A = this chain, B = another copy of it.
Amino acid sequence: RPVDVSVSIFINKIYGVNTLEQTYKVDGYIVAQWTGKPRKTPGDKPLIVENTQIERWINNGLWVPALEFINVVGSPDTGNKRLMLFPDGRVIYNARFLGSFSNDMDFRLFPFDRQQFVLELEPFSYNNQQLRFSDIQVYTENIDNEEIDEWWIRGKASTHISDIRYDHLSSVQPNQNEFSRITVRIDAVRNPSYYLWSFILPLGLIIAASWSVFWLESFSERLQTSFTLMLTVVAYAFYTSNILPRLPYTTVIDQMIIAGYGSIFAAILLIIFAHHRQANGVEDDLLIQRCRLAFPLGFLAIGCVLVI
């Protein structure tokens, strides 16, 4: 009874990931094929109907279902539209699209995070007893100039056709509240190159050099310098947050910077402690120097165990 619709989605490009909105842009084609009333075509060859002419055929009573991207944000930019009307009854809708799609995205492991770009297609009006998805084909390019792309795709697209029961609506026998939904996924991983060498590494060097405060001889030298190190961390926090993607939570890099504040605030609490511990007002050079490699180890250890 239900019309069988074969879908094919060509994906050209996924880009423009929005971290805060949890969205991403997808350019590609969508093709839908189904079979209906046989038809007389000019010269008996298949008939082509382009763009504005499709509207005319719909007015004369041509059935073209309103397949909707469930997880798209706002009406997508539909390029050229096309109807291929065959004489043996079948009809093929082919259209190019560019739209912003939504999915749950966890960027907490940034810059070493993995995401999956999802498309979800479903009829807008017709339930599963009226319109059914027969199969889904997804074609992507095998791009291996990987390095220039931010994301390494881990495989061809994985699909999953299913039925979605919508509870609220004015139904009939319990089988008019279900809708056929295509669900496409494309797993990918972020290229951590740029972020390792231009953010992670310099931050390491800066945190490291913060420890060289202990190797200063005088006390005034040690304390006055820590305020300059503190200033440097603030400068670097501004550097990162301004260029790095904005999020509602802390990344790996965000934590390194918090640790820097601590490594310096700790130092300020120690640089100041050695100067007043022992009796006879002696310069407690016994506690410092022990610190000249207690921090370079304590941080390079205790910070090495954040394997959550």
Residues on A facing B (Cβ under 8 Å): 8, 13, 15-16, 20-22, 27, 31, 33, 46, 48, 50-53, 55-56, 58-59, 65-66, 68, 72-75, 77-80, 82, 84, 86, 90, 92, 94, 96, 98, 102, 104-108, 124-126, 137, 139, 145, 147-150, 168, 170-171, 191, 193-194, 197-198, 201-202, 205-206, 208-209, 212-213, 215-221, 223-232, 234-239, 241-243, 246-250, 254-255, 257-258, 261-262, 264-265, 268, 272, 275
Contact = CB atoms under 8 A, between A and B. Distances in A.
Copies, count:
5
Contact of A250 (B65, B92, B193): B193
A142 to B, nearest CB: 12
Contact of A261 (B31, B139, B201, B241): B201
A224 B227 CA distance: 11
A148 B250 CA distance: 10
A84 B206 contact: no
Contacts of A239: 234, 237-238, 241
Nearest to A218: B220
A50 B194 CA distance: 48
6 closest cross-chain pairs (CB), A and B: A150-B248, A238-B239, A191-B248, A80-B124, A205-B265, A50-B66
Contact of A258 (B124, B202, B215): B202
A52 B55 contact: yes
Given A102-B13, A202-B261, A232-B231, A226 B209 contact: yes
